Structure formats: structure tokens, C-alpha cells
Design a protein around this ligand. Structure first.
Ligand SMILES: CC(C)(C)c1ccc(CC[C@H]2CC[C@@H](O)[C@@H]3[C@H](O)[C@H](O)CN23)cc1
Ligand SMILES: [Zn+2]
Length: 1016
């Protein structure tokens, strides 16, 4: 039944890792096609019986924020583009136009009067205006999580189905900076038949063009059968603009951009202007244009040619619509009437192009190659590799992952009930989904926008977090209060969220202290939520106003707890040291919470006069020369001091970690008997070139390999507890922390690059693992792909996105680093892993942004570090392009991305409180996730509908007995089920009516969607 994703290497015509190994990547002058060759064709190829069919496709690339904000561009440009498209298409029935960004289209359509709404629907229904992709945005493909690529796709397509009555089946991605196979994966499971891409390495375009492999069936790297395949068109030239879309010679194509004659303030840099088409020049102009088209056609296999016609924010002015349309109409009338050309040219849409290509395929005219792999890391010219944006603006990259999880938790917690309109649940969730979707844009999460635009995206995401908190806390109050007592004010705050890692300690003082006292309040209820569909334990922590606090469950059973101080790090501008201060007023309490699948668990925190029986207190040791006292108020244990030294720590039965005198990891010992395996953390810095091209928001152009950060004699703080221990050190630009709770450690870096211009800070791991030139990185949090370091390419070409994790391995040992934020990284030598923390760049890199990156702010990066023996694991063969996580590594990733949520009851007494929700939910096998749970109907619908996205990853078999778990049937999670359907991933089309109303579990590496219908 299920394909084996480990043991069968797919047979494909093009495999990108293998192609990379063989290619030479020489950057030679190809002539007018600077990165190609002088294309030749046989004029006799086309004739009366075999004509070249040419589709000229007008378009306008509209960024939802870049140099201006979304709203600034809407007011200045996009509202005029859309208004004039409506008028011009209405008045000219043969003219066509494609549109990608639904965030803008929705913003426009809601402001139109009814007369114009009807006109707009008519030009869509008749095929003149065609939506391509239909997502909220055209997202980044490097840093984005697959869950959020799906979220923004669904937001735009749901809008289109409701208001336009259409669902695109062709995708258009002309500007993201390199391309991911996560896109065809999601698109093919969302009803798509075709997709188009543009920004791939110039050497890749040349190689594929020579073999006519620019159109291909793109399947996943593990897919042996080919059921994931999606037909893909790669454009062949340097840009999507008119000079790089008519043919190989931009000096010629520029003459066919009729906006460049002067009055629009545009010109042709190749020094020959366009000229108005007339009866006296149309034969010579047609000669030149058809010659360009026939050259382009030589690179493809059918007699159907795609010619995009557009650029950024084009088709704004009425006069521009006229100048392009009238000149092209004169060319078509001539060309189409001159038999000697054997061409039929017309305005078209993207779908019309793909339909004609496949008609040719079915007529036996062409067969297409199969392809797997990705298209990172992009270079547009010379050694200019776009690996800088894997790290740029890292504060907002981390915020993306925080809001990702809060959107999932708010949608899931509120899905359990139907809500009155007055509760504003749908309103708040729509806002949250739309702001997170907007940020997936290729100038949002990428960190490539102007400073004031980054500020706009941040403000929008903060509003979205506040929306999620409101929805979550109203839902907890309803799920855990006796129904006949439940008395909501939908504007009131019953709970406040407590989040230990966002914005994080030393970033923002945002967390509330639980205030207890004999003369004010003896106790406080807290609740934990677990969005994952299996029973979960996790340590949780809260700030409390006394160290003498104990924890009980809601059966009044004692729960073991640990109290630690609250430590903050300060750059002391007097002593010129970075050192910690302990609170005299607040303390941390830590305990293990145990929470049902997709459920809630309540605990109680109670003050006492003295040390509680079931609460312990951490010891604290400050290692530094020249110490001064550190008082901690009521904290029962005195801080200890010492000169810097090496130290070792072990929590529970977990690993034993050894640290250098500078507070950095030096070894891990897995068990009592086992070796101390060398695993060393080191911080280094890259700089910028003093001559030639400069690093900026997009480009990473280092001045050689990185140099060690000079550490001096840093201050190291060691906290030792029964439940949690840690080592923290104040380094220049980074407070580095290693935390131990009995399994793989958690690493946290508080990164403040300060005023260090032209510096990139990297965290490196050095091991003696015999990895050679191989490492693995993930794609969109969905899959791990094999990388090979290539010494034939420069350092920056060997950097890849690290959206969620990376690893190196040999026959016996693996080291995996999981991340809570997307960052750039590599393995530049055998046994090494490295990941960039932040970058501050004084110069612009000449890709249109017009500024460096000088707006850095403190960010708390989070990680898990997993060292494992792998000699017993069943792994793919040497030729397989994929890799897979172990159970421990996958759970460590989930701990970063989807932790327990923590709620503190706001008032003094919670009347009607209950102890647990979800105790009867099935606890599914560990590789299965409910990625999305979303109610799809408002309260007035007679038949309620709930949508689920189910994802099964693939974990290595390494000899651990599988325990029994329960089957998860999402269609029976809510009562009174009347129907269960399998749908596309956007929920917009029903694909299968399911027997017995049971939703089957999915295969490894597959994602399915189901909708349950319920009688209400
Ligand atoms: C020549 C000059 C002015 C430096 C320049 C260079 C490049 C560009 C286009 C940049 C591309 C790729 C990066 C990307 O950030 C931008 C926006 O998303 C916009 O849609 C055009 N894109 C625009 C202008
Ligand atoms: Zn763009």
C-alpha cells in the first residue's frame, strides 16, 4: 500500500544533486545571451502544416510590501492598476491579463461598487482576467514553513472561490530567490496541474536549456512511483522583465517594451529605443521579433511558446495599456497574415499556454523528462549567491515561527465549539491568518524590505498575536468551566498567556509574575494546552513572588517542583563586563506538566511560610575573577563563587555534558559507560570585502573564512537543579546558554550584534564525525535533503536554508541541530555544522533595496542538540537524495515549534474550574500530526463542518520496540458526525466520500485533508 520512502532510489532523468556533482559552473560570455550561447534554428522547422503558436501573456508584479508598505503601494499604484485593468479589459475583448497576489485583489474588490463588482466577475468568467496561483502572496520558498505556505494559499483560494467562483490550477512564481520542491508537493495535493518558476542559478538554466529540459515532471526526492509529479516550466533567461522574456537578446527585446520611449521616464540601457509600429516599419520590426521568438522556441519541445509581457507594478496608466496593446495588435495582424513566418501569435493567459502544451503532448509531439531535487542556492550572476537572506532580519524570522504556532493553537482550541457572532472569534482568527499570510511574501520573512516596511510587518504580527491570545483564552475558559456556571464576557481576559521564549529574557520584560501572599492571595490556577495529538510531558516554568511555592494537580496530588532565581544579563558600561544580576523580588518555579492529546491540564500553585516538602531549590555558582556578592532575598540557598574552571553536569539519567572554562560545550557522554564524544561550540565572525561587490540583505560575499570571536575572560553562571540545570556565559554580542532537563540539551542565544558594522556572527559545532563532504538540511520543515559541499564553488554557494534543522553523520554517529527559527548554515569541513545568528551590513548589494541592514535588534534564538548512535538504523542507500530524522530528533523539533501553551488565571477565584480536557482523545503514533484543525462554518449553519490537515513524517527504524498507540480518526473527534470527506489541502474540493465516516491515517511523507460534517 504505502510507498517505501527509504529503500528504493527513484529513477529520474534529472536529479539535482547528481547534476551539481557533474556541472562545471563556468561563467563564460555567451554573447547577446550573456549566460547562454548564440542560438541557431532551422527556418524550415515551421511550415504551413506545423506553425509556431505564440501566447503573449500581459502581467504586473505587485509586491505586498518592499520599498513601500502594503497600504502605500495599494494607494499609489495597485488600486490604479486594477481599476485600469477592469476598464481596459472590459473595452477590449481580445486583451488578456494575469493576477497573482490575492491580498491586493481582495483589498480592491471590497472597495468597488456593485456595478463594477459585476463587471469584474464578467471579465473573470469570460477568461480575460485569469488568477494564477491564487495565494494571498507569492511566498518565499527558502525560509517559509510548509504549514504557512499552505495557510496563505488557502487564504487566497478561499477568497477566490467565494467571490469569483474560480480555483486556479496553474501556479506563477517569477520572483522568489530560488525554488523549493515543497511547492509542487502542496500544489499537487491542492488540485494543481501546472507551475512556472524563474529564479534558478544561471548555470542550471544553461545546462537544462542545452538538453531541452526546462519543462519537466517535478516529483519529490523519495517518490519512486511518481504520484507526486507536477508539470513545471522553468523560464530560460536572467529576468521576468520584457528585455529578458521575448528572446535571448535583450537589446532587441527592450525595443518591444512600448513603455520605454521617454514620456514614462523609462529607457533601454542597451541604447536602442522602442519605436511606434507603423505600416512602413512593421515588416522589419516583425522580422526582428519573430527571430527572437524562434530562438526562444529552440529551447523547448513543443510548437507552443510562452512570452510573458510585464514588469513590476506595470499596467498602471491608461496610456500604458494603450501603448502596449495597440503596438502588439499591429505586430500580430502583420505576422499572422504573412505565411512565410508560419506563426500564429495572440494575447493569452497562463492556463491557455499550458492547455496547448498538453494538447501537443497528447498528439505525440513531445515527451517530458522527470526531475527531482531543489533550486538552492540561487546566483543571478558571477559569484553573487543569494544566501544572505537566509539570515537577514532574524528577529522577524523567529517571530514567524512563534505566530505560526499561536495561529494553529487558536484555530484548534476554538474549533471544539460553535461561537456566537458577538464573540468575534471568526473576525480575530481571519485577522491573524491574514497578517501571518502577508509575512510569507518574498520581501517579508526574507528580511529584504526597507526598515519602515519591516516595522509595518512587525506591527501587523503583534496585532495577530494579540488576536490569537484572545481567542485561546476565551476557549480555555469555556472548555474548562462547568457548563451551567460558564458566564462569558467576550471582551474580558480570563487568562493571560505566559511565554518563556518570546520575545524572551533580555529582549522584552513582558511576563507577569504570579503574586501570592498570606495577606493577598494564597493560590493560583494555571492551565497547559498541548496542540499535538499524543499525550505529552514537558517542563513548564512561571514567575512567582515567593520561593516558597508548591504545585498540585486538580486531584490535589503533589507535583515535584524546582525553584531557581530569575537571572538577567547586563552590559555593565562601568566595569566593562557582561554579568548576571539576580532578582530580589521574583523567582522561577518549574514542574513537569502532563497533558492529553489536543487537550488541557489544570494545576495549582500555593504559597507557604517555609520550604515545601515537594519543592527543591537549585544551587548557583558564578565563575569569574573579581566576584562581588549576589543576594537573592528569600531564596534559601546562597550563591557560590569561584575562578573559571572546567565543569561537568548531568540531569537525571540523561547525558553528561562537559564545558570549557569559557562556558562552552566540549563533550557529550551519552551513558555511564560510554565515551566522552568531542562536540565543541565556537563563535566566529565573517566580514565584508574591501573591494568589489559588497554583502547586503540578499548577498553573502564574505572576505574569506570566519575568524574566532575574541572571548576575553567571560563570566560563566552554573545553575544545578534536580529537574533543570544550565550553563550560561556572557560573550561579546551573545549570551549563550545550554539547558539540561534529562535529554538532548536546549541551546538559547541572546544575540545583540550592537554597532558592529560589516559583521556576520556564526555559531559553529566542531566534531570528529567522519562526514566528509556530506550534510543534510531541511526544506520548509517538511523534508530533509542531502547536500554535498563543493569546493569548486565559493564559500557562500555552500550555504543553504536551515528552516528547521540540519545534521551530519558517519557510519556510527550523528549530530542533529534543530532550530526554532529559519537561519542560513552549512558544513564547510568534515565533522562541522554552522549556523548564522545575525548580520549587520553597511552597504547596499544592488538588488533594488537601496539600503544596508543596520536595524538589528536583540533576538533570542532557540535550538536542540541531539547526539545519537546510528550504526543500528536502517538508512537510505548511498545514492538516495533524502535523509530522515530519528524519533528523538523529531520530538526535539516539535518541542521548539509547538511547545505547551501556558495560561495564568487572571482573577482571584475561578468558579466552576475543571481539571482536564481531552482525556478521551486518541493518542496517535508519534510520526502523525494534526497540522491544522479549523471549523469551516459559522454558528448559523445547520450542518457544521470541521477541516483537518493530517501529516505523517518518516522516522528511522533503529531497533526501538514500537509500543501500541491508538488509531486516530479525525472524523469522530466531534460528536454527531453525518459525513466524512477527503478534500484538497485547501478544503475547497471534495475528492472522496468516506465509508463509515472514518478518515484513514496517511502514509509516511504524505499529507491529507478531511472534512467532517455534523448535525447541529
Ligand atoms: C538596478 C536596481 C535599481 C539596483 C534594481 C536591481 C534589481 C531590481 C529587482 C529586484 C527583484 C529581486 C529582489 C526582490 O526583493 C525584489 C522585489 O520583490 C521586486 O518585486 C523586484 N525584486 C530592481 C532594481
Ligand atoms: Zn517581487
Amino acid at each position: 500500500q504505502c510507498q517505501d520512502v527509504v529503500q528504493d532510489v527513484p529513477n529520474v532523468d534529472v536529479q539535482m544533486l547528481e547534476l551539481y556533482d557533474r556541472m562545471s559552473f563556468k561563467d563564460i560570455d555567451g554573447g547577446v545571451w550573456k549566460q547562454g550561447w548564440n542560438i541557431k534554428y532551422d527556418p524550415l522547422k515551421y511550415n504551413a502544416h506545423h506553425k509556431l503558436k505564440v501566447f503573449v501573456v500581459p502581467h504586473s508584479h505587485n509586491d505586498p510590501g518592499w520599498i513601500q508598505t502594503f497600504e502605500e503601494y495599494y494607494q499609489h499604484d495597485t488600486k490604479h492598476i486594477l481599476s485600469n485593468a477592469l476598464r481596459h479589459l472590459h473595452d477590449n475583448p481580445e486583451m488578456k491579463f494575469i493576477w497573482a497576489e490575492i491580498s491586493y485583489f481582495a483589498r480592491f474588490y471590497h472597495d468597488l461598487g456593485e456595478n463594477k463588482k459585476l463587471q469584474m466577475k464578467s471579465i473573470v468568467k469570460n477568461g480575460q482576467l485569469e488568477f494564477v496561483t491564487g495565494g494571498w502572496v507569492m511566498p518565499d520558498e527558502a525560509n517559509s514553513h510548509w504549514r504557512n505556505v499552505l495557510l496563505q494559499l488557502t487564504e487566497g483560494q478561499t477568497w477566490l472561490k467565494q467571490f469569483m467562483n474560480v480555483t486556479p490550477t496553474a501556479s506563477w512564481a517569477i520572483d522568489p530567490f530560488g525554488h523549493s520542491p515543497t511547492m509542487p508537493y502542496i500544489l499537487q495535493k491542492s488540485g494543481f496541474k501546472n507551475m512556472l518558476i524563474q529564479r534558478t542559478h544561471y548555470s542550471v538554466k544553461k545546462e537544462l536549456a542545452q538538453q531541452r529540459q526546462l519543462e519537466f515532471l517535478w516529483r519529490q526526492i523519495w517518490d519512486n512511483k511518481g504520484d507526486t509529479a507536477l508539470f513545471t516550466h522553468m523560464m530560460p533567461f536572467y529576468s521576468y522583465d520584457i528585455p529578458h522574456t521575448c528572446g535571448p537578446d535583450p537589446k532587441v527585446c527592450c525595443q518591444f517594451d512600448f513603455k520605454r520611449m521617454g514620456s514614462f521616464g523609462l529607457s533601454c540601457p542597451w541604447k536602442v529605443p522602442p519605436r511606434t509600429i507603423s505600416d512602413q516599419n512593421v515588416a522589419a520590426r516583425s522580422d526582428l521579433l519573430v527571430d527572437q521568438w524562434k530562438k526562444k522556441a529552440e529551447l523547448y519541445r513543443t510548437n507552443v511558446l510562452l512570452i510573458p509581457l510585464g514588469d513590476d507594478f506595470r499596467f498602471k496608466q491608461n496610456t500604458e495599456w494603450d501603448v502596449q496593446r495597440v503596438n502588439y495588435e499591429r505586430l500580430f495582424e502583420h505576422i499572422n497574415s504573412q505565411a512565410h513566418f508560419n506563426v500564429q501569435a495572440q494575447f493569452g493567459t497562463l492556463q491557455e499556454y499550458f492547455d496547448a502544451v498538453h494538447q501537443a503532448e497528447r498528439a505525440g509531439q513531445a515527451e517530458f523528462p522527470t526531475l527531482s531535487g531543489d533550486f538552492f542556492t540561487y546566483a543571478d550572476r558571477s559569484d553573487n549567491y543569494w544566501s544572505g537572506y537566509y539570515t537577514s532580519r532574524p528577529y522577524h524570522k523567529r517571530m514567524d515561527r512563534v505566530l505560526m504556532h499561536y495561529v494553529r493553537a487558536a484555530e484548534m482550541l476554538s474549533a471544539w465549539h460553535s461561537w456566537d457572532g458577538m464573540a468575534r472569534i471568526e473576525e480575530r482568527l481571519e485577522q491573524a491568518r491574514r497578517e501571518l499570510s502577508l509575512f510569507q511574501h518574498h520581501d517579508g520573512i526574507t528580511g529584504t524590505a526597507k526598515t519602515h516596511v519591516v516595522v509595518d510587518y512587525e506591527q501587523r504580527m503583534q496585532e495577530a498575536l494579540k488576536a490569537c491570545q484572545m481567542v485561546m483564552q476565551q476557549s480555555v475558559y469555556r472548555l474548562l468551566t462547568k457548563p451551567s456556571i460558564y458566564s462569558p464576557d467576550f471582551s474580558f481576559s480570563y487568562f493571560t498567556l505566559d511565554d518563556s521564549r518570546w520575545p524572551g529574557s533580555g529582549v522584552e520584560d513582558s511576563r507577569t509574575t504570579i503574586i501570592l501572599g498570606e495577606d493577598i492571595l494564597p493560590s493560583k490556577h494555571v492551565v497547559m494546552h498541548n496542540t499535538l495529538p499524543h499525550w505529552r510531558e514537558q517542563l513548564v516554568d512561571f514567575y512567582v513572588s515567593s520561593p516558597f511555592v508548591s504545585v498540585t494537580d486538580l486531584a490535589n496530588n503533589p507535583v515535584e517542583a524546582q525553584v531557581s532565581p530569575v537571572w538577567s544579563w547586563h552590559h555593565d558600561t562601568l566595569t566593562k563586563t557582561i554579568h548576571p544580576q539576580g532578582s530580589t523580588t521574583k523567582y522561577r518555579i518549574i514542574f513537569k506538566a502532563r497533558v492529553p492529546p489536543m487537550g488541557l491540564a489544570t494545576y495549582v500553585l500555593t504559597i507557604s511560610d517555609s520550604k515545601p516538602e515537594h519543592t527543591s531549590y537549585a544551587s548557583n555558582l558564578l565563575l569569574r575573577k573579581n566576584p562581588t556578592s549576589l543576594p537573592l532575598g528569600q531564596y534559601p540557598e546562597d550563591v557560590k563563587f569561584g575562578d573559571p574552571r572546567e565543569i561537568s553536569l548531568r540531569v537525571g539519567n540523561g547525558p553528561t555534558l562537559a564545558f570549557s572554562e569559557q562556558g562552552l560545550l566540549k563533550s557529550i557522554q551519552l551513558t555511564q559507560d560510554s565515551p566522552h564524544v568531542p562536540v565543541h561550540f565556537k563563535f566566529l565572525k565573517y566580514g565584508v570585502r574591501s573591494h568589489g561587490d559588497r554583502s547586503g540583505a540578499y548577498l553573502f560575499l564574505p572576505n574569506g573564512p570566519a575568524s574566532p570571536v575574541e572571548l576575553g575572560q567571560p563570566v560563566v553562571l552554573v545553575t544545578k537543579g534536580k529537574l533543570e540545570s544550565s550553563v550560561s556565559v556572557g560573550l561579546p554580542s551573545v549570551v549563550h546558554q545550554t539547558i539540561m532537563r534529562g535529554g538532548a540539551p536546549e541551546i538559547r542565544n541572546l544575540v545583540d550584534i550592537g554597532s558592529l558594522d560589516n559583521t556576520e556572527i556564526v555559531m559553529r559545532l566542531e566534531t570528529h564525525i567522519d562526514s566528509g563532504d556530506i550534510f543534510y538540511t531541511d526544506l520548509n520543515g517538511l523534508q530533509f535533503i542531502k547536500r554535498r559541499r563543493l569546493d569548486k564553488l565559493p564559500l557562500q554557494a555552500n550555504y543553504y536554508p536551515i528552516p528547521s534543522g540540519m545534521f551530519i553523520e558517519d557510519a556510527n554517529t550523528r549530530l542533529t541541530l534543530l532550530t526554532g527559527q529559519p537561519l542560513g548554515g552549512s558544513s564547510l569541513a568534515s565533522g562541522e555544522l554552522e549556523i548564522m545568528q545575525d548580520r549587520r551590513l553597511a552597504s547596499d548589494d544592488e538588488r533594488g533595496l537601496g539600503q544596508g541592514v543596520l536595524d538589528n535588534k536583540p533576538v533570542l534564538h532557540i535550538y536542540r542538540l541531539v547526539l545519537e548512535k546510528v550504526n543500528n538504523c536502517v538508512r537510505p542507500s548511498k545514492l538516495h537524495p533524502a535523509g530522515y530524522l530519528t524519533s528523538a530528533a523529531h520530538k526535539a523539533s516539535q518541542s521548539l515549534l509547538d511547545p505547551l501553551d501556558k495560561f495564568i488565571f487572571a482573577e482571584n477565584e475561578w468558579i466552576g474550574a475543571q481539571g482536564q480536557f481531552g482525556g478521551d482523545h486518541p493518542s496517535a503514533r508519534e510520526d502523525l500530526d494534526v497540522s491544522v484543525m479549523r471549523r469551516l462554518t459559522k454558528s448559523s449553519a445547520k450542518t457544521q463542518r470541521v477541516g483537518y490537515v493530517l501529516h505523517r513524517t518518516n522516522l528511522m527504524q533503529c531497533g526501538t520496540p514500537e509500543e501500541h498507540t491508538q488509531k486516530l480518526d479525525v472524523c469522530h473527534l466531534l460528536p454527531n458526525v453525518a459525513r466524512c470527506e477527503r478534500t484538497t489541502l485547501t478544503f475547497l474540493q471534495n475528492l472522496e466520500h468516506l465509508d463509515g465516516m472514518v478518515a484513514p491515517e496517511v502514509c509516511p511523507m504524505e499529507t491529507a485533508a478531511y472534512v467532517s460534517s455534523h448535525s447541529s
